[PDB]
Amino acid sequence: TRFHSFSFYELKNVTNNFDERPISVNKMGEGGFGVVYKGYVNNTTVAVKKLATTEELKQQFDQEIKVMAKCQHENLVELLGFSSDGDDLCLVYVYMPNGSLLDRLSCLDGTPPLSWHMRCKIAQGAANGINFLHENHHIHRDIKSANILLDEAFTAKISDFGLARASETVMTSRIVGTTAYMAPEALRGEITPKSDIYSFGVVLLEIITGLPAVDEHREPQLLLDIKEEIEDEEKTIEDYIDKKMNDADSTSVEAMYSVASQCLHEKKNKRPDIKKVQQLLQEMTA
């Protein structure tokens, strides 16, 4: 697939010379080291990711284009174009008005809490995006709620393919990802789609509880450990369900938790593949 060849100065103009301030009062954030700026061009709102070692920075930009050229799906963010003529390298995407699942789970800037009904649809949507990537022999290497973007109708879109790796178990010296979401073997340097499943189980626990993967002022500081308190019969998942929901029945919440439990197996070979995860989430609703 081919993309629009945007000029650096057109992107510099529509993003106000790459301003570092927020929208209130561009800056948005940086998932894979590249400041995302809000922009408007050709009567359509966009998100411009300016990248941002010199060759490793360029390898992050080249992979994104190589992966998105091949990968086209409704549950992945769309790349509209990019820019090479400038000093820095830019990647233009279709703007997502509901931000990340992280910011919507935390109600950042006063947004209403997502209902259980929207949460199930986002879980199913996110799991289609991972299935399409794995079907097409790609490992995301950074599955987290901050990397699940939400469109005009709260449709889950996986994003950030700067760390994406082809498959089509390999080992690596430069270990990359988000500690709070990573699997045991990923933290050791193994590269496998089985790690993407583990990280997705952490996202399901954030969806159910509404608690972020890591909270420094919390006990336990890591969300994945809450699974062990529930397994020891000290607490139940019922006691961790997000209280900012009025439409969450126990059967569907327990059913989502069963998937998150299986996803979070420490033994990589005991975890279910994405196609099984997708079937279980579909059976949950239905």
Stated as kind and residue range, the H or E segment containing 171 is strand 170-171
Nearest 5°: the CA angle 75, 143, 172 is: 130
Q: Which of residues 11-30 bind ligand 42P (CB under 6 A)?
A: 23, 28-29
Q: Which of 93, 181, 198, 257 binds ligand 42P (CB under 6 A)?
A: 93
Helix and strand numbers (H, E) in the chain are 9, 11
d(CA 88, CA 278): 39
Residue 28 counted as an annotated binding residue: yes
Residue whose CB is less far from ligand 42P, 10 or 151: 151
Helix, coil or strand: residue 29: strand
For position 49 contacting ligand 42P by CB under 6 A, the verdict is yes
Give the DSSP letter of residue 170: E
For position 132 contacting ligand 42P by CB under 6 A, the verdict is no
Residue whose CB is less far from ligand 42P, 65 or 255: 65
Q: Which of residues 156-175 bind ligand 42P (CB under 6 A)?
A: 159-160
DSSP helix, strand, coil percent of the chain (3-state; round to 5): 40, 15, 45
Q: Which of 99, 113, 212, 272 binds ligand 42P (CB under 6 A)?
A: 99
Residue whose CB is less far from ligand 42P, 70 or 235: 70
Q: Whole-number minimum distance, CB 178 to ligand 42P, in Å?
A: 9
Give the DSSP letter of residue 222: B
Helix, coil or strand: residue 156: strand
Residue 227 counted as an annotated binding residue: no
Of the candidate spans 144-152, 171-179, 198-206, 244-252, the one that interacts with ligand 42P by CB under 6 A turns out to be: 144-152
For position 95 contacting ligand 42P by CB under 6 A, the verdict is yes
Q: Which of 142, 196, 215, 242 is catalytic?
A: 142
Clarify whether 142 is annotated catalytic: yes
Q: How many CB atoms lie within 10 A of CB 141?
A: 24
Q: Whole-number minimum distance, CB 67 to ligand 42P, in Å?
A: 11
Residue 146 counted as an annotated binding residue: yes
Residue whose CB is less far from ligand 42P, 30 or 247: 30
For position 77 contacting ligand 42P by CB under 6 A, the verdict is yes
148 is written with which tokens? 């699940």
Residue 29 counted as an annotated binding residue: yes
Is 223 within 8 Å of 202 (Cβ atoms)?
Answer: yes
Residue whose CB is less far from ligand 42P, 32 or 257: 32
Stated as kind and residue range, the H or E segment containing 48 is strand 44-50
For position 257 contacting ligand 42P by CB under 6 A, the verdict is no
DSSP string, 70-126: H---TTBPPEEEEE-SSSS-EEEEE--TT-BHHHHHTTGGGPPPPPHHHHHHHHHHH
Residues that bind ligand 42P in the complex, under the rule CB under 6 A: 23, 28-29, 31-32, 36, 47, 49, 77, 93, 95-97, 99-100, 102-103, 146-147, 149, 159-160
Annotated binding-site ranges:
28-36, 49, 144-147, 160
